[PDB]
């Protein structure tokens, strides 16, 4: 049970995540949206990165914001699953399908980097489908993205989900490039989508971080030369030699006929 039925012209339905994310239908429009609930004391802080970039097809866009007494209700167009769940269910993606989806993922990251943001927490789970047919994806949100103060993308604090953590973060003596780190993560996603398992895995983190530091991963021979070439241009490169999010988009793999 909930205390209210409606926020503005939006009928509330059911919680998708605790008391934080609610389903909603616009009463005049009849369209189904998703409503994320923040405290008014810290909502414009949390949402600051969402107002840095121009709108992009593969980055969730805020539809409306309704300010209550105690809470701010931020509305988004709904999703239809996530990439992680999709890869698990499918086991692995065909190169044709993977190329379509990964191009959208890379485009989203390229938009963030070139607009002066680093994500820091990139995972498959963070990308969610826009349509029922699960052909279009978008970055779920930019809430926890770091806004660069000028050009410099140097980060001191270690961030990331262990599987997506780059070697530069682990054996860091202070600063590292946030953009290079986000690109590393893109490599892991691409591998995981195509192969159906993480490139680096182990029993416990310390052993996992050893494999990453040394670059202990294998690519199946079954993947196409171009697919393999793209993987290694991210995961088997030091930041200075490693592709940028934008450069990924020009890669010959996407241009294949399939």
């Amino acid at each position, epitope marked *: 049970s909930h205390c209210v*039925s*409606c926020i503005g012209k939006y*009928l509330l339905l*059911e919680p998708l995540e605790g008391d934080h994310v609610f389903r909603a239908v616009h*009463l*005049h*429009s*009849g369209e*189904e949206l998703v409503c994320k609930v923040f405290d008014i004391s810290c909502y414009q802080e949390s949402l600051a990165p969402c107002f840095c970039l121009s709108a992009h097809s593969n980055i969730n866009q805020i539809t409306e914001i309704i300010l209550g007494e105690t809470k701010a209700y931020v509305f988004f167009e709904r999703s239809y699953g996530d990439m992680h769940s999709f890869v698990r269910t499918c086991k692995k993606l065909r190169e044709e399908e993977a190329a379509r989806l990964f191009y959208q993922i890379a485009s989203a990251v390229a938009h963030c980097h070139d607009g002066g943001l680093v994500l820091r927490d990139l995972k498959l789970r963070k990308f969610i489908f826009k349509d029922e047919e699960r052909t279009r994806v978008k970055l779920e949100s930019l809430e926890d993205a770091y806004i660069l103060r000028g050009d410099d993308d140097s980060l001191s604090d270690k961030h990331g989900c262990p599987a997506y953590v780059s070697p530069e973060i682990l054996n860091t003596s202070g600063s590292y490039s946030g953009k290079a780190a986000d690109v590393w993560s893109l490599g892991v996603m691409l591998y995981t989508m195509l192969v159906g398992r993480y490139p680096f895995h182990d029993i416990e983190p310390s052993s996992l971080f050893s494999k990453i530091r040394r670059g202990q991963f294998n690519i199946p021979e079954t993947l196409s030369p171009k697919a393999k070439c793209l993987i290694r241009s991210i995961l088997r490169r030091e930041p200075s030699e490693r592709l940028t999010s934008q450069e990924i988009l020009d890669h010959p793999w996407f241009s294949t006929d399939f």
Partner: nanobody
Amino acid sequence: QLQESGGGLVQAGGSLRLSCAASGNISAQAYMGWYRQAKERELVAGISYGATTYYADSVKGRFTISRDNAKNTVYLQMNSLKPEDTAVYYCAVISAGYHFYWGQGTQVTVS
């Protein structure tokens, strides 16, 4: 003042049709839909005055909703009736100062 109809019993795989009308001073822009309890009250189907609809994930493709703005009434056609769908179906009409009218309840069983 919501007068409704259509309650019945049916074999697993059959079909029922529900209907509800309102003859009062309700808004032209008023949203209309059907909830069911059985368990708690969830919205199974809804429809805006511009005919754009919502369906619960469980009943997508199986159930259908439509409103006649002239008569000021809303219908809920349901097919391939599962055993789980057994519940009391309350019609609702919502406006937005703010109004929210319920129906008495139309029972429908599956076996």
